[PDB]
PDB file of C-alpha atoms in Angstrom:
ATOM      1  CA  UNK A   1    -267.237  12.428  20.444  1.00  0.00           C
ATOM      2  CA  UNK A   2    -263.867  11.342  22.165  1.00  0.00           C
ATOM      3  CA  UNK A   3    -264.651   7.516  22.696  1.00  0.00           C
ATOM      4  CA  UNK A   4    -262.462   7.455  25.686  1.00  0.00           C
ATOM      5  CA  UNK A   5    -265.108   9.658  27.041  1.00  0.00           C
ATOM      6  CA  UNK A   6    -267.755   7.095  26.759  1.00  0.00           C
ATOM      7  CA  UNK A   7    -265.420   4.329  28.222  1.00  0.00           C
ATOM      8  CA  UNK A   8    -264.250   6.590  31.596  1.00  0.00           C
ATOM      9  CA  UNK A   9    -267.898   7.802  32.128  1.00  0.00           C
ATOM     10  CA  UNK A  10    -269.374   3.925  32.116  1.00  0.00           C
ATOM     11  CA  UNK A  11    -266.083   3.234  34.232  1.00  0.00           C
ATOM     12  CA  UNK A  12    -266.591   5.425  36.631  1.00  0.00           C
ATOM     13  CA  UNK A  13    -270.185   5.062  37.219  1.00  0.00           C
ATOM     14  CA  UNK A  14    -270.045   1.517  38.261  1.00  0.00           C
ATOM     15  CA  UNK A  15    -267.648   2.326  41.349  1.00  0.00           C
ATOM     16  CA  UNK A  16    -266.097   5.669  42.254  1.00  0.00           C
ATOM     17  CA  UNK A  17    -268.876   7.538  41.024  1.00  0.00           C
ATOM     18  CA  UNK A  18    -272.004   5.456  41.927  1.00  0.00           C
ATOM     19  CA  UNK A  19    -273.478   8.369  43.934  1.00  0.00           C
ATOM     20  CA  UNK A  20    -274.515  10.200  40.582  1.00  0.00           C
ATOM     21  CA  UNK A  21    -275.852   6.841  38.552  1.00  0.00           C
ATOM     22  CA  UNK A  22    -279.364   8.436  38.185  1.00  0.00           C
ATOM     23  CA  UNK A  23    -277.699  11.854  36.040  1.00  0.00           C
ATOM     24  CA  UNK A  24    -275.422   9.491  34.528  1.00  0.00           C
ATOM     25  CA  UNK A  25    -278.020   7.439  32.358  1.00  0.00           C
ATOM     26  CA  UNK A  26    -279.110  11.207  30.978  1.00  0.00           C
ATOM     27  CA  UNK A  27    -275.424  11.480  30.249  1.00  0.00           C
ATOM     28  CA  UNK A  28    -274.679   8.724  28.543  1.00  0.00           C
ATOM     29  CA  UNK A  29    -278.197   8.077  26.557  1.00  0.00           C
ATOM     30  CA  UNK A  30    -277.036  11.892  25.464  1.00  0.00           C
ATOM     31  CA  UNK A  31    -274.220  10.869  24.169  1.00  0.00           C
ATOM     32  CA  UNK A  32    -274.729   8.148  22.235  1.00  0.00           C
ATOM     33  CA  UNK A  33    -277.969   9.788  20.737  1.00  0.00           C
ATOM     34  CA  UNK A  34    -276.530  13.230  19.488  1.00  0.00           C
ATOM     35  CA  UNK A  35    -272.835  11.199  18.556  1.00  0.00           C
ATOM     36  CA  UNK A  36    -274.024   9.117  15.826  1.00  0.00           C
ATOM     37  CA  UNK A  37    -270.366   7.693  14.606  1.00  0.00           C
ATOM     38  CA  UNK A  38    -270.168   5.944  17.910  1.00  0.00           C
ATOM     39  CA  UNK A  39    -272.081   3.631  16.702  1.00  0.00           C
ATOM     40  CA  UNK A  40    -269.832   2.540  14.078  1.00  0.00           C
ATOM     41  CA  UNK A  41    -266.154   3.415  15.291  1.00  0.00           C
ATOM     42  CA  UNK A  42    -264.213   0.322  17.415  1.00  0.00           C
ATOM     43  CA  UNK A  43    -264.474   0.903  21.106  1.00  0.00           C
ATOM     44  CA  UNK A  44    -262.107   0.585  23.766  1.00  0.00           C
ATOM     45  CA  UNK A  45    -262.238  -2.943  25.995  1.00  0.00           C
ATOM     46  CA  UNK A  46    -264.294  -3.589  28.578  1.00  0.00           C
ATOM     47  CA  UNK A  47    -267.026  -0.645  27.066  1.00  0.00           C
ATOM     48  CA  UNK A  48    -270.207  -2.614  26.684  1.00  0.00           C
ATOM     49  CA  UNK A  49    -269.397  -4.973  29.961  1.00  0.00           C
ATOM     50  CA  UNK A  50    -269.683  -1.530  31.732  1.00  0.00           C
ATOM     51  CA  UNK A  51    -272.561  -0.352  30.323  1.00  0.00           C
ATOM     52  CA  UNK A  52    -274.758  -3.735  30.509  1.00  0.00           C
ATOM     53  CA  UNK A  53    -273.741  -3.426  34.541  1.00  0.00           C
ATOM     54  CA  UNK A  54    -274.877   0.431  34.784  1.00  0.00           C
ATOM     55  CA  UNK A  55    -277.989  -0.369  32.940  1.00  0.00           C
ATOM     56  CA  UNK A  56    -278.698  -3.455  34.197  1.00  0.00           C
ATOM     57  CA  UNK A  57    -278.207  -1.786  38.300  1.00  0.00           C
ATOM     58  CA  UNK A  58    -281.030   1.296  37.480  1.00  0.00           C
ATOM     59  CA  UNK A  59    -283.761  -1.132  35.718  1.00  0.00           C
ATOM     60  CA  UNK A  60    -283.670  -3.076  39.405  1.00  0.00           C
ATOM     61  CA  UNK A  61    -284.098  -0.173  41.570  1.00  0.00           C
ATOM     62  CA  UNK A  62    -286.596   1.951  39.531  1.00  0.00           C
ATOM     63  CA  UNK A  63    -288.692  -0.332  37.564  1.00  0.00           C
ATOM     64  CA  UNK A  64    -292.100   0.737  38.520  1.00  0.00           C
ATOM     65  CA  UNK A  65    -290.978   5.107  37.807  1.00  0.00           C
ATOM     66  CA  UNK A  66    -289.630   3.917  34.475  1.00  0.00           C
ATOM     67  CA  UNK A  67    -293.117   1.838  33.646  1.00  0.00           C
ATOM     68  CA  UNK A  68    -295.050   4.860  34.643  1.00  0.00           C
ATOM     69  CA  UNK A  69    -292.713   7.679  33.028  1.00  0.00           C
ATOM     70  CA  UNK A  70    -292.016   7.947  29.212  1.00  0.00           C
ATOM     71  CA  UNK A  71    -289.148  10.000  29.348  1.00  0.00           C
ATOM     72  CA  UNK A  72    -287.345   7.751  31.516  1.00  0.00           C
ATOM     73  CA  UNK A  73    -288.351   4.884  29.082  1.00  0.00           C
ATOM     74  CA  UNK A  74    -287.033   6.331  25.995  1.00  0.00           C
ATOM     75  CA  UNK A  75    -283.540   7.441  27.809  1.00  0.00           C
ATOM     76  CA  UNK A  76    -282.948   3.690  28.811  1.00  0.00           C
ATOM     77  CA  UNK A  77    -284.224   2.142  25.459  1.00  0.00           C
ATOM     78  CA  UNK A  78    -281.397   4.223  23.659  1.00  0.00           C
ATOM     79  CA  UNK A  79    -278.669   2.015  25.490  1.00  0.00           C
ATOM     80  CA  UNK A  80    -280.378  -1.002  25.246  1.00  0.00           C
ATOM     81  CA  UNK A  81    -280.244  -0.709  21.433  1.00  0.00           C
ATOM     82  CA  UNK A  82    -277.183   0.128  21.646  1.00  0.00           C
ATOM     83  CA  UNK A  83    -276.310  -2.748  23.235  1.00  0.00           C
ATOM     84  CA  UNK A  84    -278.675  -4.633  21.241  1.00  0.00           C
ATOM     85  CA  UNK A  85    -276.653  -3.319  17.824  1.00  0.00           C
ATOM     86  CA  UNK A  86    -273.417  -4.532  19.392  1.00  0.00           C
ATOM     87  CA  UNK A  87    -275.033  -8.408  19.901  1.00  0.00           C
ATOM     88  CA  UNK A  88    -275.435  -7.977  23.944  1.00  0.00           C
ATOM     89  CA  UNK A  89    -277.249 -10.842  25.189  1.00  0.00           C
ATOM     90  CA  UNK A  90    -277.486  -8.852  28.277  1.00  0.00           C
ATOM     91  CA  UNK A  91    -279.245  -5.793  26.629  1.00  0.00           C
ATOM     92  CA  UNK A  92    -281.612  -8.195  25.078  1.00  0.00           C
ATOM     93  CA  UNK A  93    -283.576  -9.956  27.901  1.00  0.00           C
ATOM     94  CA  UNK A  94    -283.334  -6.802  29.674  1.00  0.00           C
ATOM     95  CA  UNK A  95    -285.562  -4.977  26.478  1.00  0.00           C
ATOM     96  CA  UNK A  96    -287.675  -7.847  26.982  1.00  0.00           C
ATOM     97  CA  UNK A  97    -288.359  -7.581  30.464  1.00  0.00           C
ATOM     98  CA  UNK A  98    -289.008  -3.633  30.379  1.00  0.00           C
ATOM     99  CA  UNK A  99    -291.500  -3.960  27.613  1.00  0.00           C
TER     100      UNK A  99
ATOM    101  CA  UNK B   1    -307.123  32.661  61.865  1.00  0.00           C
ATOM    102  CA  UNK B   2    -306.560  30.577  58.609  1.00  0.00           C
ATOM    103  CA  UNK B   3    -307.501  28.165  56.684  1.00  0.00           C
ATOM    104  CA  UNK B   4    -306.323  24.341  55.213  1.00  0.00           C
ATOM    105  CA  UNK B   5    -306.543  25.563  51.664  1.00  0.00           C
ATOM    106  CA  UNK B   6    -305.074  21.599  50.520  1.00  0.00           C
ATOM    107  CA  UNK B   7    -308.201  19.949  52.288  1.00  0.00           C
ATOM    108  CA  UNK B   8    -310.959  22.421  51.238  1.00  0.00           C
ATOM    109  CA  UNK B   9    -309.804  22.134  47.865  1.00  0.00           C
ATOM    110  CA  UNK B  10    -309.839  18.547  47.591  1.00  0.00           C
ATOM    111  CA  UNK B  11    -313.449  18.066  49.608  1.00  0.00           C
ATOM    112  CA  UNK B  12    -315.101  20.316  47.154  1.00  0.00           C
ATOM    113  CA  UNK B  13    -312.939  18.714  43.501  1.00  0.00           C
ATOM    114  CA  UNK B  14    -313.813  15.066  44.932  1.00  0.00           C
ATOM    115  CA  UNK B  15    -317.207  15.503  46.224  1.00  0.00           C
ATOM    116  CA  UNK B  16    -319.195  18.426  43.536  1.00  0.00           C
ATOM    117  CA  UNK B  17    -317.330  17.494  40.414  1.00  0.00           C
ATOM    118  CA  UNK B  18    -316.116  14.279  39.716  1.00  0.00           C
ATOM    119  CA  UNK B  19    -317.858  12.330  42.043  1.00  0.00           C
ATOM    120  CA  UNK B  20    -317.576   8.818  41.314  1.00  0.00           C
ATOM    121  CA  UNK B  21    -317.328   8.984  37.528  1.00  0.00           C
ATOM    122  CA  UNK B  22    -314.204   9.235  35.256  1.00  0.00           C
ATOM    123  CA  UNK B  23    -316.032  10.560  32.547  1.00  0.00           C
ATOM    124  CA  UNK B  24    -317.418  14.021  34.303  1.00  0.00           C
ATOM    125  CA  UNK B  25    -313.733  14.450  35.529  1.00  0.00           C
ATOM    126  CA  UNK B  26    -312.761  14.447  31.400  1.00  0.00           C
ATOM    127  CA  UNK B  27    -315.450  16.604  30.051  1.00  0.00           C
ATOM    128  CA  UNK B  28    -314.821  18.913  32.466  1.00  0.00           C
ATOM    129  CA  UNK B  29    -310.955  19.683  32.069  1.00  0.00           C
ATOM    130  CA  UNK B  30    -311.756  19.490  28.322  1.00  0.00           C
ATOM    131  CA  UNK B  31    -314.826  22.106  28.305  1.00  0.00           C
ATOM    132  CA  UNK B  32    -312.201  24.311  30.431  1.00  0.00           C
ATOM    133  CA  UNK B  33    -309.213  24.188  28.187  1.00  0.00           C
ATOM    134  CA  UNK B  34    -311.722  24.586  24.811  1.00  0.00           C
ATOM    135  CA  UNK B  35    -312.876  27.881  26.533  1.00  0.00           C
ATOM    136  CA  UNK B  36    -308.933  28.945  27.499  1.00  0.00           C
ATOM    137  CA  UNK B  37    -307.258  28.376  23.798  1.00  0.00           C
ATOM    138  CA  UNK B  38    -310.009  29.515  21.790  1.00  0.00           C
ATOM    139  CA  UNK B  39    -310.686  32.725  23.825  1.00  0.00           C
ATOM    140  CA  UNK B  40    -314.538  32.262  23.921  1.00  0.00           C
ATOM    141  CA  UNK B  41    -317.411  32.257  26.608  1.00  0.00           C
ATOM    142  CA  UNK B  42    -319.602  30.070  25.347  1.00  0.00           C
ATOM    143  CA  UNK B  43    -318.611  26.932  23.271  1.00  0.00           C
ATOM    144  CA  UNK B  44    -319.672  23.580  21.956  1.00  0.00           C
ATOM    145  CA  UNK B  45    -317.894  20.376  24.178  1.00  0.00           C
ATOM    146  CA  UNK B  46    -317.264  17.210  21.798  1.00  0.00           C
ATOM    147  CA  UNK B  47    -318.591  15.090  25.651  1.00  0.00           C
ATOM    148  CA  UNK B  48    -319.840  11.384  26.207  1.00  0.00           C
ATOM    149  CA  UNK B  49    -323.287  11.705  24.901  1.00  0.00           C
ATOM    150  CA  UNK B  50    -324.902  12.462  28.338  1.00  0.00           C
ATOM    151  CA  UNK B  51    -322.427  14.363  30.713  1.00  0.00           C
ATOM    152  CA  UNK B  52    -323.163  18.021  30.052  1.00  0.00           C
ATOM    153  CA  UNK B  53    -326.731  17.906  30.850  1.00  0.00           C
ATOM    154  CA  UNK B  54    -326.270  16.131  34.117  1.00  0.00           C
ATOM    155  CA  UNK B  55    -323.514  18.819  34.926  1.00  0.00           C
ATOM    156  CA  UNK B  56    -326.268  21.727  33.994  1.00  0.00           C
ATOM    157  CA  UNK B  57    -328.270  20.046  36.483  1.00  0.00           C
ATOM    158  CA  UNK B  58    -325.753  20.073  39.030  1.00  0.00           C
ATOM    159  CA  UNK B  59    -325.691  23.793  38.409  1.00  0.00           C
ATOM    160  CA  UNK B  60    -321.591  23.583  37.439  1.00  0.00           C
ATOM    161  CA  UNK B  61    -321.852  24.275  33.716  1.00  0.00           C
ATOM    162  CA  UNK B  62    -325.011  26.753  32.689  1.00  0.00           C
ATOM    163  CA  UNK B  63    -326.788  26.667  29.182  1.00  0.00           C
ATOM    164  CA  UNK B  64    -327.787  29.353  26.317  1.00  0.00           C
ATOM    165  CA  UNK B  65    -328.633  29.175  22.978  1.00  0.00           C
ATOM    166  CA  UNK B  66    -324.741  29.998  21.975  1.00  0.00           C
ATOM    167  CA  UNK B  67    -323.219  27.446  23.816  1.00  0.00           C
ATOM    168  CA  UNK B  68    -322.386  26.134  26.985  1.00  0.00           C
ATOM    169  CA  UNK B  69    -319.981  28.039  29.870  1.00  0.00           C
ATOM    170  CA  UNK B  70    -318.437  27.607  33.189  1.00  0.00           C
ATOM    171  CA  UNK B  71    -320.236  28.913  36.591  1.00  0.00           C
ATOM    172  CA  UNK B  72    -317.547  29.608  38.911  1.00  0.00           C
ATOM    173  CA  UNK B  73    -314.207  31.475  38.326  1.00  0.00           C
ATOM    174  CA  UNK B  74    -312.274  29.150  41.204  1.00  0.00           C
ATOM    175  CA  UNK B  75    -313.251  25.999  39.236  1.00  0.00           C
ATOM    176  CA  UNK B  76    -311.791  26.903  36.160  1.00  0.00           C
ATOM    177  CA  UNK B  77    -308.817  28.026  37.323  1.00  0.00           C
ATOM    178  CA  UNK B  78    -308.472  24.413  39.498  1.00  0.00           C
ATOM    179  CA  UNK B  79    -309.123  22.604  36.304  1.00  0.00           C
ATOM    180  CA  UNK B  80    -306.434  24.469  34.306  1.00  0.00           C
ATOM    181  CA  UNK B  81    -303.727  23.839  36.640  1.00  0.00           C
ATOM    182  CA  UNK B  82    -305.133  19.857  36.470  1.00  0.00           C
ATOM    183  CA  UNK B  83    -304.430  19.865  32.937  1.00  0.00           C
ATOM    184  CA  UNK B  84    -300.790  21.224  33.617  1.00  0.00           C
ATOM    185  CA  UNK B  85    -300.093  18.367  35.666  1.00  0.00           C
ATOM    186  CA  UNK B  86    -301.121  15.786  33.196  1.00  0.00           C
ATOM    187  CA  UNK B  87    -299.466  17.280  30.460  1.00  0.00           C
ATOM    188  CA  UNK B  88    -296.424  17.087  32.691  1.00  0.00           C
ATOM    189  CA  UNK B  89    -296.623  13.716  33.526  1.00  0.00           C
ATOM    190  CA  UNK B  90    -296.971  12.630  29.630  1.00  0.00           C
ATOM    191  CA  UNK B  91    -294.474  14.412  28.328  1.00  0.00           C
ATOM    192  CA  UNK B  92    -291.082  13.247  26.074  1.00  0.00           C
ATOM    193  CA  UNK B  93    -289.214  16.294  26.724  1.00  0.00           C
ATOM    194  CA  UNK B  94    -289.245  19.702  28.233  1.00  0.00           C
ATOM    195  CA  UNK B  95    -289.966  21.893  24.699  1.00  0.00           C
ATOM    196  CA  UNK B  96    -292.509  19.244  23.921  1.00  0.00           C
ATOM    197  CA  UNK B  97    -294.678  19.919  26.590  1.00  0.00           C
ATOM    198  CA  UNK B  98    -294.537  24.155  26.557  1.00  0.00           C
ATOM    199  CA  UNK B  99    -295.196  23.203  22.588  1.00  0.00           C
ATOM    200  CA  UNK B 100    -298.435  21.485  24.412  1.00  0.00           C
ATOM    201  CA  UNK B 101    -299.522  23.478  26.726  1.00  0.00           C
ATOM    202  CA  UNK B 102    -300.156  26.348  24.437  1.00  0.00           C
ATOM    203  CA  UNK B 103    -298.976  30.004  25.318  1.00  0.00           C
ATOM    204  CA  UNK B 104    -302.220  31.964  25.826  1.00  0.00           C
ATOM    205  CA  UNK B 105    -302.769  34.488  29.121  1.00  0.00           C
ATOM    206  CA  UNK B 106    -304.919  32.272  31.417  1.00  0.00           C
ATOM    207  CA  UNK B 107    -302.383  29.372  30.860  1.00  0.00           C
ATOM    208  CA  UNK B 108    -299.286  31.744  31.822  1.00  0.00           C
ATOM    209  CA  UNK B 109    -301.353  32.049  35.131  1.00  0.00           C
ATOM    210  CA  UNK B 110    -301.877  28.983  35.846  1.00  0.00           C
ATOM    211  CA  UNK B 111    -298.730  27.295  35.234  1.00  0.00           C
ATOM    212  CA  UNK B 112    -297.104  30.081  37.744  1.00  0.00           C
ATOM    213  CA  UNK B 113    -299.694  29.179  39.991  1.00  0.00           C
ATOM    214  CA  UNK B 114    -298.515  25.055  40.060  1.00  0.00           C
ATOM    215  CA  UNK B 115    -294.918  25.994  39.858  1.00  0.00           C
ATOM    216  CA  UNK B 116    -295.465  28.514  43.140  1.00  0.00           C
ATOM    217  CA  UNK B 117    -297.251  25.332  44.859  1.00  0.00           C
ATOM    218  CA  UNK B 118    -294.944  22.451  44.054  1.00  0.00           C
ATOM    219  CA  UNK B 119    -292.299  24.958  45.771  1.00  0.00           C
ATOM    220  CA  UNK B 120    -293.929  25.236  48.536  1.00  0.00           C
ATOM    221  CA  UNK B 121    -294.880  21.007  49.294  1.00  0.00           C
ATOM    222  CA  UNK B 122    -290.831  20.803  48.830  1.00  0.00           C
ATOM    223  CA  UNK B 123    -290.971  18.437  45.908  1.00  0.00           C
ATOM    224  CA  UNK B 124    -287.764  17.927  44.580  1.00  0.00           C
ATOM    225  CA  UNK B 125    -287.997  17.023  41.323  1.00  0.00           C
ATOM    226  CA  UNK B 126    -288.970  20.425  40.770  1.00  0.00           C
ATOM    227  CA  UNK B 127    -285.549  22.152  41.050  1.00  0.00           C
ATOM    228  CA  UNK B 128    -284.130  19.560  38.007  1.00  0.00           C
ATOM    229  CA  UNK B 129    -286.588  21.356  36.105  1.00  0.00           C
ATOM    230  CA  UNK B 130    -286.355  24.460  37.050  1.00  0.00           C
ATOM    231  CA  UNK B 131    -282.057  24.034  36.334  1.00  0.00           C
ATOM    232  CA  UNK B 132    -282.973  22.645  33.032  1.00  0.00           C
ATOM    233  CA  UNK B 133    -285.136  25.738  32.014  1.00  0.00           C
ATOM    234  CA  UNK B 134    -283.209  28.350  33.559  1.00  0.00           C
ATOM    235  CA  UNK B 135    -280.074  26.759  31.977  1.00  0.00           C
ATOM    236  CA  UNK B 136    -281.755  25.802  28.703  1.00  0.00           C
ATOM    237  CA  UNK B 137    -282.182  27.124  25.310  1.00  0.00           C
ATOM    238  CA  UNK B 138    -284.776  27.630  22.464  1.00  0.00           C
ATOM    239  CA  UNK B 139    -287.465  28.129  25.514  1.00  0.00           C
ATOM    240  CA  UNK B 140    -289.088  31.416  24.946  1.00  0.00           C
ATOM    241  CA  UNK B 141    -288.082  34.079  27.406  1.00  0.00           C
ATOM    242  CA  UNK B 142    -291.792  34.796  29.028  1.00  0.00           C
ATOM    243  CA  UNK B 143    -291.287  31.005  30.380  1.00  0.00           C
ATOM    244  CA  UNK B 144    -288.762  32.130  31.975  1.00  0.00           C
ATOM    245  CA  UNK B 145    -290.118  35.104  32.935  1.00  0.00           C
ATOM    246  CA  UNK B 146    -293.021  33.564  34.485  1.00  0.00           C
ATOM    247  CA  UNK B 147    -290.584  31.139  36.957  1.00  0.00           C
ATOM    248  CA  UNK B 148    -288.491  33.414  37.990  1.00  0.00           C
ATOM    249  CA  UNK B 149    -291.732  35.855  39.466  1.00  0.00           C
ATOM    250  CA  UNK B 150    -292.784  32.575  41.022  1.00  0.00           C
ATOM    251  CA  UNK B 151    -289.676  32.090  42.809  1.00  0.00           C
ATOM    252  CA  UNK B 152    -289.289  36.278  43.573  1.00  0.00           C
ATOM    253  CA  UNK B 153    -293.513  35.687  45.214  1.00  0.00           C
ATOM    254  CA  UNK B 154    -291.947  32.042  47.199  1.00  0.00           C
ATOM    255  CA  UNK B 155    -290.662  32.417  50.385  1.00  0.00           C
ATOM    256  CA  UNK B 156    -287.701  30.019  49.642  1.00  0.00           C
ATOM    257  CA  UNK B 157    -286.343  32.990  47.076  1.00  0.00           C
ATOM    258  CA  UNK B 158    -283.243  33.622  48.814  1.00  0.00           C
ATOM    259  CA  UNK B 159    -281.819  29.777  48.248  1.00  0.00           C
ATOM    260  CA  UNK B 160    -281.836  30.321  44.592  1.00  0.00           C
ATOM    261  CA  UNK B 161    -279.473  33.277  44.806  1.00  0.00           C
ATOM    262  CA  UNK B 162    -276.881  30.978  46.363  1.00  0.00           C
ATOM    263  CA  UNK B 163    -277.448  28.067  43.617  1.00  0.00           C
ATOM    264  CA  UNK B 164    -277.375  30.251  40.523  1.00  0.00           C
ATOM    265  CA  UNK B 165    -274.885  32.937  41.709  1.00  0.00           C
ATOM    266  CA  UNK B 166    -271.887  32.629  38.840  1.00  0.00           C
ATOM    267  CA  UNK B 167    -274.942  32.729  36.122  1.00  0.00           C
ATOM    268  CA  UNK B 168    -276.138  35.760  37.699  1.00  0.00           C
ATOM    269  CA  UNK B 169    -272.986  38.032  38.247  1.00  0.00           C
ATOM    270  CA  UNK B 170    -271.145  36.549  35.151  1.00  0.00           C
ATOM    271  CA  UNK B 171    -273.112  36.726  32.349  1.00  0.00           C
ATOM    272  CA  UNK B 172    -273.007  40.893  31.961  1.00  0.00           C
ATOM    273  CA  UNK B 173    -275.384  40.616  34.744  1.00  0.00           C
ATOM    274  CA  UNK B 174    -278.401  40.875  32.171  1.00  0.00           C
ATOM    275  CA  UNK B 175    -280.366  38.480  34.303  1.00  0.00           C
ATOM    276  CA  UNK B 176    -279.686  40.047  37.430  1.00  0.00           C
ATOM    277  CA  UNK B 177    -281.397  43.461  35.569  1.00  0.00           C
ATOM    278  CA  UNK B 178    -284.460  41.516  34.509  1.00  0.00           C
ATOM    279  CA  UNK B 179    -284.937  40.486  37.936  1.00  0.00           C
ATOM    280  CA  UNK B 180    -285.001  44.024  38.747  1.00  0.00           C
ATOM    281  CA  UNK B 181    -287.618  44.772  36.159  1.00  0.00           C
ATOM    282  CA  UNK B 182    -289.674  42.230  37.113  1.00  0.00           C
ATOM    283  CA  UNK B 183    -289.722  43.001  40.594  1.00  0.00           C
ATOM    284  CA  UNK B 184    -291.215  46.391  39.780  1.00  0.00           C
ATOM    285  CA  UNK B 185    -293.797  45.238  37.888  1.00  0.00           C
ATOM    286  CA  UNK B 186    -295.247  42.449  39.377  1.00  0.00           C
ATOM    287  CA  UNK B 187    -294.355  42.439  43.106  1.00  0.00           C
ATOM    288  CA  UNK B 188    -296.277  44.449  44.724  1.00  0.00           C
ATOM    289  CA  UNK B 189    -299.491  44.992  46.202  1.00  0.00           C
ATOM    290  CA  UNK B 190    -301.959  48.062  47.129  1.00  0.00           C
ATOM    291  CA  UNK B 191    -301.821  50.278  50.217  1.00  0.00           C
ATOM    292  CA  UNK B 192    -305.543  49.857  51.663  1.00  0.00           C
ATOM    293  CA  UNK B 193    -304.464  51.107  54.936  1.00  0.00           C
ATOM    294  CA  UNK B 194    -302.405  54.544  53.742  1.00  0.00           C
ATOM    295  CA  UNK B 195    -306.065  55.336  51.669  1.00  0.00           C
ATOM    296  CA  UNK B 196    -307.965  54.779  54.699  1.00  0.00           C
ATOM    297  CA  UNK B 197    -305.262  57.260  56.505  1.00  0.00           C
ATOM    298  CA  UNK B 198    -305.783  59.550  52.934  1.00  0.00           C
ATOM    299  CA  UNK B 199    -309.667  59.187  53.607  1.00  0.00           C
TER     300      UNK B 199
END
C-alpha cells in the first residue's frame, strides 16, 4: 500500500534486479489489483516510465506463452490498464498489439 | 527387463482411439468424466450424432439397454488424467481449477497420478505450483494431502526436504506429523515373498 513500494519494485526490475522480471510481473499486477487507492493517490516520478519499460521488455520475449496462456494474459492486461488509466501512449499500442 | 511405458501409451491413445478424428477424441474424455462425477456405470453421452456407435463397433465403448459404459479399466484412467491436463492449461487461477476439476475418489487418483509423472519428465513449471499450493490458503487439506504422497512415492523426495525445511520444523512441526501419518497409511506395499516363506 506504501507507494514507494511500487516505485522501488518497477526500479529495480529494470536493472539490478532483471534476473527475477518473470516473478516480478506477478508482483506487481498483485499489487495494483488487491491495492485499489493506488489508482487514485499521486505517484512518485519516474513510476509509469518504469513500468511501460518492464512491461514493454516481457511482451517481446514471451509473446507466443502469453497468446496461448490466460493467466498470463490477464496478469499483463492489469498493468496495461493501468497504464492506460494514467494516459500512457505506451500502454496503449501495446493492448493493441496483444489483443 | 522393462518396458517404454511413454511409447506404448501413446501407440495405443493415437492409433485405437482417436485416430484421425477430433470428434472421437471429445466424446470420449466426456463419456469418461460423465461416468466419474456422477458415480454411475452406465450413462447417456450428449455425442456428435454418430460417434458412439462407431466406437461400439470398435469394441471401446459396449451397449445395454441402461446406457452406454467403458470396456477397459486402463483407458479410463488415461482419459481422466487427459482431462486434468486441459483443465490445467485453461485455467485463471489455481482455486479455479480444483473448483473444476471436481473432488470425487477416481479424480483424487488421477490427479496424483499426473502430478507423480510431471515429476518424473523434470518439468519445471511444476515446482511453482507445487510452492503455490503447499504455501497457499483456502485449498482444502486432502489437495494437499494427495501431493505430498506423490512426492513421499517420487524418487526426487529427498530435494523437497531441503526446499521447505523452515516450514517444516517451524510451524509446531504439524506438517512434519502428517507426513508421518501419511507415510503409514499409504506407503507401503505387501510381502508376497514372506507368505510364500509362511506357505
Amino acid at each position: 500500500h506504501c507507494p514507494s513500494t511500487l516505485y522501488s519494485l518497477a526500479k529495480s526490475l529494470n536493472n539490478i534486479a532483471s534476473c527475477y522480471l518473470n516473478q516480478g510481473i506477478t508482483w506487481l499486477s498483485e499489487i495494483l489489483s488487491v491495492n485499489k487507492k493506488l489508482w487514485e493517490k499521486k505517484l512518485e516520478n519516474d513510476t509509469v516510465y518504469y513500468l511501460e519499460c518492464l512491461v514493454r521488455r516481457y511482451i517481446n520475449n514471451e509473446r507466443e506463452r502469453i497468446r496461448r496462456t490466460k493467466q498470463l494474459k490477464q496478469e499483463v492486461l492489469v498493468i496495461l490498464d493501468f497504464l492506460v488509466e494514467k494516459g500512457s501512449v505506451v500502454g496503449y499500442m501495446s493492448r493493441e498489439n496483444i489483443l | 527387463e522393462s518396458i517404454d511405458y511413454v511409447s506404448f501409451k501413446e501407440k495405443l491413445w493415437n492409433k485405437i482411439i482417436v485416430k484421425n478424428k477430433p470428434s472421437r477424441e471429445q466424446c470420449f474424455l466426456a463419456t469418461a468424466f460423465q461416468r466419474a462425477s456422477e458415480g454411475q456405470f452406465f450413462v447417456s453421452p450428449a455425442c456428435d450424432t454418430g460417434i458412439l456407435d462407431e466406437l461400439v463397433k470398435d469394441g471401446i465403448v459396449g451397449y445395454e439397454a441402461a446406457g452406454y459404459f467403458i470396456t477397459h479399466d486402463i483407458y479410463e484412467e488415461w482419459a481422466l488424467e487427459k482431462k486434468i491436463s486441459v483443465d490445467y492449461i485453461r485455467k485463471a487461477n489455481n482455486n479455479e481449477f480444483f473448483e473444476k476439476i471436481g473432488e470425487s475418489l477416481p479424480v483424487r487418483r488421477s490427479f496424483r497420478n499426473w502430478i507423480s509423472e510431471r515429476l518424473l519428465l523434470d518439468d519445471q513449471s511444476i515446482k511453482p505450483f507445487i510452492a503455490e499450493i503447499v504455501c497457499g490458503e483456502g485449498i482444502s487439506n486432502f489437495w494437499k494431502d494427495e501431493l505430498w504422497v506423490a512426492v513421499l512415492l517420487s524418487d526426487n523426495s529427498s530435494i523437497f526436504f531441503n526446499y521447505f525445511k523452515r516450514y517444516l520444523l517451524s510451524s509446531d512441526q504439524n506438517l512434519l506429523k502428517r507426513l508421518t501419518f501419511l507415510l503409514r497409511l499409504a506407503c507401503k506395499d505387501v510381502d508376497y515373498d514372506l507368505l510364500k516363506q509362511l506357505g
